[model samples]
Target: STKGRYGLTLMISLAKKEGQGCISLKSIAEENNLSDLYLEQLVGPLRNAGLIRSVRGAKGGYQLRVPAEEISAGDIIRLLEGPESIESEPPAQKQLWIRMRDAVRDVLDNTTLKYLAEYVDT
Candidate 1:
């Protein structure tokens, strides 16, 4: 939950700003009201996962490595959040928890960044 929340914020920012050169982490931080340091932590995995690319220089920032439609929220989440296993809960609730987990996975897995960023907020 922790990683996914801010992680999604950064990803969505990138999606919205895609094709606009690069979006600075500083600018994204300001826009989303988040800390650059925190986002820096988040970006490392994303870059390592090949979801984003970093440019060099004063004008350099970040851009999605692939088209938004090609990047699933599931891809970003797995890279940032890792695989979450809900199999150890009490037997009574384990099945329920698994169902919840699966449902979340289904939604994220099917949804692409393009779909997300296409929404007109307002």
Candidate 2:
């Protein structure tokens, strides 16, 4: 369910360096203590979704295609994790699930990469 966790990490990494030029996934992985190979696997889908763009050559890496402010957490989550689908025989159960999903969606949709990148943890 948290498959998109690292994907969000990748996006936030790019967002943090939004205008500083491209940063390699290796460096991103190193900074986040993540697997470079896993990050590499995520690159394809992100690139294909038009969320990120890659550069070539020695100084090449990856960068966001749009401003971080324009990309919501939900956008990345949905792309990587796929949309949520709730199916239950009980109407009450289905309603509860939908409510829960909507609650999560609300937070994600309102939170942009820009906000996440600028966040300072204590």
Candidate 3:
């Protein structure tokens, strides 16, 4: 996969744009220097999962279905990356992998978009 970077970027954009107005994918793409088609591929799954909503018409675009604080990084990561695990490894290696994986999951599961949006220093 694309390491979910693009998807994360897209989600962050929506989070940042919250309370302003709906943002068109085209604008989001342009701001992030991404392709519209690539962004289009992400929207369907995100919308299907109830992560985002879109508006129709000239002044319409996308918005989060829930408050950014209610949405976790893990929520976005799971939908975009799907299930991730280490299989077919030696017991020693598997144990290490499991620990690492769990640590990452814990952070992702706990870190919300609200934290991310404000985490930036500017």
Candidate 4:
């Protein structure tokens, strides 16, 4: 889940800067205590997926292609993590995994970036 975790970090950072202009991964990495190089890897796939847009030249960085409200956690998670799967000998165990996966997906699919970005910890 490294990709899902870091990709969310990158997206949430961008979402926070929605209108203030682009932000460099270096700044994000430093602020979130993550690796700038690692974030670089996450960015390529995200950009290719059309989830984000990149700027050029000095003072350039990245920004979300769409508004935070329009992007769901599921979108990012699925893109970064791909499809979920589980293999088990027992049909009962397999059914249980499916149920768990669906439950998680239900939450992720409904949770938008806007909600996450605007969340305040108390």
Cα lDDT, all candidates: 0.84, 0.86, 0.82, 0.86
> How well is each residue in 18-67 modelled by candidate 3, as lDDT tens digits?
87778888898898887888788888788999988987773538998878
Candidate 1 TM-score, true structure as reference: 0.85
For candidate 2, the per-residue lDDT at 56 reads 83
Q: Can you give the lDDT of residue 46 in candidate 1?
A: 89
Q: Lowest-scoring 10 consecutive residues by lDDT in candidate 1? A: 83-92
Across 79-108, the per-residue lDDT of candidate 2 in tens digits comes to 888874455458887788889989999999
Ranking by lDDT: 4, 2, 1, 3
> Which structure among the candidates has the greatest TM-score?
4
State TM-scores per candidate.
0.85, 0.86, 0.86, 0.88
On TM-score, who's better, 1 or 2?
2
Off by over 4 Å in 1: 84-92
Deviation (Å) of 18 in candidate 4: 0.8
Cα displacement (angstroms), candidate 2, residue 92, comes to 1.7
lDDT of 2 at 82: 86
TM-score of 4: 0.88
